[PDB]
Amino acid sequence: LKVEKFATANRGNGLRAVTPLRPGELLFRSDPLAYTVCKGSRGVVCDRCLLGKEKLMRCSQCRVAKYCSAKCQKKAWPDHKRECKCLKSCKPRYPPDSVRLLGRVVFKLMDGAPSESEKLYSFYDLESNINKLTEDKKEGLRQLVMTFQHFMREEIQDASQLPPAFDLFEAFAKVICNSFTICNAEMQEVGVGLYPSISLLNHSCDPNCSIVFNGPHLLLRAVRDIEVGEELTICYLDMLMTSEERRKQLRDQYCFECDCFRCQTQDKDADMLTGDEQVWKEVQESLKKIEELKAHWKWEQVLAMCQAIISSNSERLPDINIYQLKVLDCAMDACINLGLLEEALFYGTRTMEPYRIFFPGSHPVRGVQVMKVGKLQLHQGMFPQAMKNLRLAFDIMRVTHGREHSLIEDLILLLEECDANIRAS
Ligand SMILES: Nc1ncnc2c1ncn2[C@@H]1O[C@H](C[C@@H](N)CC[C@H](N)C(=O)O)[C@@H](O)[C@H]1O
Ligand SMILES: [Zn+2]
Ligand SMILES: [Zn+2]
Ligand SMILES: [Zn+2]
C-alpha cells in the first residue's frame, strides 16, 4: 500500500502518501460498496455495467431494472434481489437516487465477508457532519428517511431488521458528503456509489490525485509528484466554477469553507467571467435546463437550445466565459450522440484553449475532451491535427486513466488508425 489513513489537524481523517509517488501512479482501486444508475440514465444504460445500448432487456419481475445482457442481469441479481419488489410497487413513481442507493447499502452491510471497498475506511467511519447541518438540510433528510421507509416497506418494516449500528438519518447525512458520481468513458454522469476507502480523501481545488471510473470500477491515481507524508486530495467539484460558486457548494453540501490557494486568491475567476455580466447571466440561467436535458440524454433538445445561445451571443460573448464554454461542450456532446460530426468538431475545437486554461496539468476531463476532438478530426480526415490531439490525449490520459483503464487501448487504436492514414496519404 502506497497510502494510509491519518488524522489531520482541522479537517478530520485524511489520506497520505506512505512512499514518494509519481504522476500517473495507481494508488487504489475499488468497486463500489453499493451503487445505482442515476435518475437521468435509468433505462438508457445497463443497470449493472452502466454502458449505453440501443436494446436493453427489462427485468421480468419489476420491469424497472434494465440490462444489456443475460450476464449483467445475473451478476446484478444479488444487488437487485431485495429492491425488485420495491421498485415494482411504486412504478411509475421512482425514489430519489440516494434512497435506491441506501436500499442496496443496508443489506450489503450484513455480509460477513469484508468488502474490499472498505479496506481503509468503512461505511460506519463515514463523516456525517450531523452537528454542522442547517435546519433546512435536516428537514430534507427527514423527508428522505420517510421516503426510504415507504419505498422499502415490502422488505423492511422496522429498525430491528437492520444492523443496530445503522441509523437511517445519519446514513442519508453520510451520503450527502461521501457520494461519488460515476461517469462513463465520455464523462456523462450515469450512476452514484459509495466507495468508503476513497471517501477518506479530503478536497482541494488544486488536487494532487484524481479518480476515474471504468464502469462502476474506480481508479485513484497521483496526477503529479507527491512526497512521503503529503496529504492526498481530490477535487470534489466541476473545474468550470468560480471561487464563489465552489465556496457555496462546499459550504452547502460538504459543511466546510474552502481555504485552498485558488479560493483565497480568486484563481482564474476573471477569465471564467469574461464578457458582460448582463449577457452571460442569461447563459448561466439557460444552462439549468440544458444540463437537465443532457442528464436525461435528450440530445435533440440540448442541441436546439445550445444553437440558439451560440448564434445569438457570437458577436458579444467569448468562448472562454465558463457559461458559454459549458454550452459549447453540451452542443459538442449532443452532436456526437446524434452523429453530427462536422458540427461536433466545430464546437469541440472552440473548447480547446479554454480547457487548457481551466484544467491545468493532468485532468481526466480534459484528456477525454482532447481525445474527442482528435477522433472527430480523424473522422474528418484532418490527419496531422488529429495525430497531435490524439498524442496530447495520451500524454494526459496516461496519467489520469492509466493502462488499467480500457479507454487507453481505444486511444491507441485511434492513434494507429491515424498513423496508417498519414502513411497512406
Ligand atoms: N478542504 C477541506 N477543508 C475542510 N474540511 C474538508 C475539506 N475536504 C473535506 N473536508 C471534510 O471532509 C468531509 C468529506 C469526506 N468525504 C472526507 C474525509 C473526512 N475528512 C473524514 O474524516 O471522514 C467534508 O464534508 C468535510 O467535513
Ligand atoms: Zn451490462
Ligand atoms: Zn426486478
Ligand atoms: Zn478551494
Numbering used by the authors: 4 to 428
Reproduce text from the manuscript describing this model.
We present here, in addition to the independent high resolution co-crystal structure of the full length human SMYD3 with the S-adenosyl methionine (SAM) analog Sinefungin, a detailed mutational and biochemical assessment of SMYD3 function. Baculoviral SMYD3 was co-crystallized with the SAM analog Sinefungin, and the structure was solved to 1.8 Å resolution. SMYD3-Sinefungin crystallized as 2 symmetry-related molecules/unit cell (P21). The domains comprising the “core” of the split-SET (N-SET, C-SET, post-SET) of SMYD3 and the MYND domains overlay with those of corresponding conventional domains. About one third of the SMYD3 substrate binding site is formed by the Intermediate SET spacer (I-SET) region located C-terminal to MYND. The peptide is bound in the conventional manner; i.e., the methyl-lysine is oriented on the opposite surface of SMYD3 from the SAM/Sinefungin methyl donor, with a narrow channel connecting the two surfaces of the SET domain. For example, residue F259 interacts with the adenine ring of Sinefungin and the Y239 of the aromatic cage, which itself packs against Y257. The SMYD3 CTD is a superhelical 9 α-helical bundle which constricts the floor of the substrate binding site opposite to the I-SET domain, preventing the trivial insertion of substrates. In fact, the CTD clamps further down on the peptide binding space of SMYD3 than of SMYD1, featuring a greater superhelical pitch, such that it contacts the MYND domain (circled region of Fig. 8). Close inspection of the overlay indicates that the H4 peptide forms part of the support for the SAM binding pocket in the SET8 structure, whereas the SAM binding pocket is fully formed and stabilized in SMYD3, independent of any substrate.
